[PDB]
Design an enzyme around this catalytic site. Structure first.
Site, PDB file in Angstrom:
ATOM      1  N   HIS A  26      60.787  -5.291  44.545  1.00  0.00           N
ATOM      2  CA  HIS A  26      61.681  -5.984  45.371  1.00  0.00           C
ATOM      3  C   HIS A  26      62.356  -7.387  44.923  1.00  0.00           C
ATOM      4  O   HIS A  26      62.922  -7.840  45.573  1.00  0.00           O
ATOM      5  CB  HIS A  26      60.530  -6.503  46.587  1.00  0.00           C
ATOM      6  CG  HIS A  26      59.479  -7.491  46.093  1.00  0.00           C
ATOM      7  ND1 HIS A  26      59.890  -8.880  45.393  1.00  0.00           N
ATOM      8  CD2 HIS A  26      58.395  -7.823  45.880  1.00  0.00           C
ATOM      9  CE1 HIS A  26      58.901  -9.640  45.321  1.00  0.00           C
ATOM     10  NE2 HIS A  26      57.909  -8.891  45.330  1.00  0.00           N
TER      11      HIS A  26
ATOM     12  N   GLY B  74      57.050 -17.645  43.088  1.00  0.00           N
ATOM     13  CA  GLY B  74      57.731 -17.149  41.640  1.00  0.00           C
ATOM     14  C   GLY B  74      56.296 -16.658  40.858  1.00  0.00           C
ATOM     15  O   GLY B  74      56.774 -16.552  39.637  1.00  0.00           O
TER      16      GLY B  74
ATOM     17  N   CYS C  83      55.287 -13.795  41.521  1.00  0.00           N
ATOM     18  CA  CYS C  83      55.307 -12.292  41.474  1.00  0.00           C
ATOM     19  C   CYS C  83      55.537 -11.746  39.989  1.00  0.00           C
ATOM     20  O   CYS C  83      56.726 -12.359  39.296  1.00  0.00           O
ATOM     21  CB  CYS C  83      56.631 -12.091  42.299  1.00  0.00           C
ATOM     22  SG  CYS C  83      56.552 -12.451  44.064  1.00  0.00           S
TER      23      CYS C  83
HETATM   24  C1  LIG Z   1      55.900 -14.069  44.531  1.00  0.00           C
HETATM   25  C2  LIG Z   1      56.541 -14.918  45.006  1.00  0.00           C
HETATM   26  C3  LIG Z   1      56.956 -14.663  46.590  1.00  0.00           C
HETATM   27  O1  LIG Z   1      56.068 -14.935  47.407  1.00  0.00           O
HETATM   28  N1  LIG Z   1      58.239 -14.160  46.926  1.00  0.00           N
HETATM   29  C4  LIG Z   1      58.191 -13.893  48.484  1.00  0.00           C
HETATM   30  C5  LIG Z   1      58.342 -12.083  48.824  1.00  0.00           C
HETATM   31  N2  LIG Z   1      57.572 -11.888  49.502  1.00  0.00           N
HETATM   32  C6  LIG Z   1      58.040 -10.516  49.344  1.00  0.00           C
HETATM   33  C7  LIG Z   1      56.948  -9.238  50.176  1.00  0.00           C
HETATM   34  C8  LIG Z   1      57.220  -8.036  50.427  1.00  0.00           C
HETATM   35  C9  LIG Z   1      58.630  -7.697  49.733  1.00  0.00           C
HETATM   36  C10 LIG Z   1      59.459  -8.550  49.052  1.00  0.00           C
HETATM   37  C11 LIG Z   1      58.972  -9.612  48.873  1.00  0.00           C
HETATM   38  S1  LIG Z   1      59.662 -11.434  48.283  1.00  0.00           S
HETATM   39  C12 LIG Z   1      59.389 -13.811  45.962  1.00  0.00           C
HETATM   40  C13 LIG Z   1      60.498 -14.157  45.501  1.00  0.00           C
HETATM   41  C14 LIG Z   1      59.753 -13.071  44.768  1.00  0.00           C
END
Ligand SMILES: */C=C\C(=O)N(Cc1nc2ccccc2s1)C1CC1
Ligand SMILES: */C=C\C(=O)N(Cc1nc2ccccc2s1)C1CC1
EC number: 3.4.19.12
Lengths: 305, 300
Positions: free
Chosen positions: A41, A143, A145
């Site tokens: 994603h 961040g 992720c």
């Molecule tokens: C890890 C950080 C975060 O919470 N985000 C927000 C996003 N949540 C999702 C859930 C499902 C699909 C895509 C995303 S992006 C992030 C920027 C990376």
């Protein structure tokens, strides 16, 4: 002596964390051999994540749409690909710090260590368990992720988890390193709840055995119970059923203390009756269920790596 | 979201752990540049643990009486000396993995990470706190002496603890890296006992703020307290006095949440009186005191 929640040493994994930025999104990547792994994603726009067509989002991107940064060295991308929910980025140079590693998928109730990172720089490390409802109760901010979970066997890192999203209940969802989600979750910004958590019964019993191995004996008792009788009271308190294989695995700890598993189940049965109400075991006023039997043994016997 | 007891990434310390043997005794050491640091009781024999004269034991030692191994490699000791309770072994090779680092002495209530090691080999990492009685509630099997505690800030490792002993009560004592013990303890196996322990009040208040930051408010109340009447009540529950310096330390968390420090003190006062009533705070059914105000902002 003593007994704490203990993470694996994180140095073998620290050297694999990179920063992966695709058009204004930035998260963490795992650099192994000449490939960088990260959640797919990262290619989503803040408007595409409602209902993303990942096939079409990736077919539009090419290598130049991805900047990979290892510390301050930029990694040139020479190929890009998708496997399930993870994005595979092929890079010019292989990671000289690549450990002996293996991608594995863990069962619910197994533990692992998480190296929490932000912009590719490791920030902290903690020990968590895969819940029966396939979530983890982690600590992740914006961040984080791409942070990974792992165990260590001798000198081999078993990567088992990559962090993708936070559920509205505060708990976290992610995939194994081949991009398969744990639990019934999808990578979209949609309302997603997890099933009601249950408690990992076999870990509760193992932690009780760590209690008696540290002098805590006030919860013991003499009355044994049957597996059927215990599973009925486990049913009412949302405890996972206790299988005959759980009793065997708890064999070692049953010997080292001379308490039958089914004796301990009555200790746990009565603890589930009117509770603890401030009364403590190993400094806890609730029953801890994120220590596996192997965890109790590897800490009550001092195995290194 | 989420709030977990979190240790620092242990990689920068793993590269410094070595194994120090002297006679029949093996423990861990810390290899920084061309010096190895370990507890000095490594030179004790079985008749030497009640009343050792360490100056007398060390003058009898030659460099080759100390065997130092870094993995497979045998490091050659070219000199030795003693600083308080830490032995310092000068080796012919400076450690290529030596990070940027400092030796610091912490105060009661401060947290740090422990890299538990056995035979120079890192076994696990966890977070713990210097208790008010100057002990730590660690996880330390035999032969973990010389395991160190540390913090990392930017990429500089501040070392603050070296493990030396377990006490009859099961808790652990050690020194800073200048070899000075935390608390009134000596590296002798004569009867020693920690003073009475107390809850670290400023840390409990920071954890309550962290619970509010993560979305829980059920424990707040409409009341406030004075600093003095809080301290009078808290000490009846074995709590550390809360000084003016502590409430200034909690000023940033207070501003971030909109709750005055004395109002959160009233909250804690009532929690001590009532209990949880079947509920939990940040996953815990008791009041948690091993998170500093700094730990909280780093994780929220
Ligand atoms: C890890 C950080 C975060 O919470 N985000 C927000 C996003 N949540 C999702 C859930 C499902 C699909 C895509 C995303 S992006 C992030 C920027 C990376
Ligand atoms: C490193 C293991 C350890 O802590 N012990 C306990 C000891 N306490 C003292 C105190 C003074 C001098 C020497 C020692 S060793 C031991 C296994 C022996």
């Amino acid at each position: 002596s003593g007994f704490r929640k203990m993470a694996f040493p994180s140095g073998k994994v620290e050297g694999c964390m990179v920063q992966v930025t695709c058009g204004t999104t930035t998260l963490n990547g795992l650099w192994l051999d000449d490939v960088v792994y990260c959640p797919r994603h990262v290619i989503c726009t803040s408007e595409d994540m409602l209902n993303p067509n990942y096939e079409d989002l990736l077919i539009r991107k090419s290598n130049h749409n991805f900047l990979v940064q290892a510390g301050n060295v930029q990694l040139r991308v020479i190929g890009h690909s998708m496997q399930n929910c993870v994005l595979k980025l092929k890079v010019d140079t292989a990671n000289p710090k690549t450990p002996k590693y293996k991608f594995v998928r863990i069962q619910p109730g197994q533990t692992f260590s998480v190296l929490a990172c932000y912009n590719g720089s490791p920030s902290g490390v903690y020990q968590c368990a895969m819940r029966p409802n396939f979530t983890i109760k982690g600590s992740f901010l914006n961040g984080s992720c791409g942070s990974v979970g792992f165990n260590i066997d001798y000198d081999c890192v078993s990567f088992c988890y990559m962090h993708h999203m936070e559920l509205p209940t505060g708990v976290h969802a992610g995939t194994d390193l081949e991009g398969n989600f744990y639990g019934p979750f999808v990578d979209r910004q949609t309302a997603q709840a997890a099933g009601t958590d249950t408690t990992i019964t076999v870990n509760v019993l193992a932690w009780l055995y760590a209690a008696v191995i540290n002098g805590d004996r006030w919860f013991l008792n003499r009355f044994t119970t049957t597996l059927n009788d215990f599973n009925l009271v486990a049913m009412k308190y949302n405890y996972e059923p206790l299988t005959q294989d759980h009793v065997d695995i708890l064999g070692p700890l049953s010997a080292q203390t001379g308490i039958a598993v089914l004796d301990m189940c009555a200790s746990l049965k009565e603890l589930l009756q009117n509770g603890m109400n401030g009364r403590t075991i190993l400094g806890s006023a609730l029953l801890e269920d994120e220590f596996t039997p192997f965890d109790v043994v590897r800490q009550c016997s001092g195995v290194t790596f």
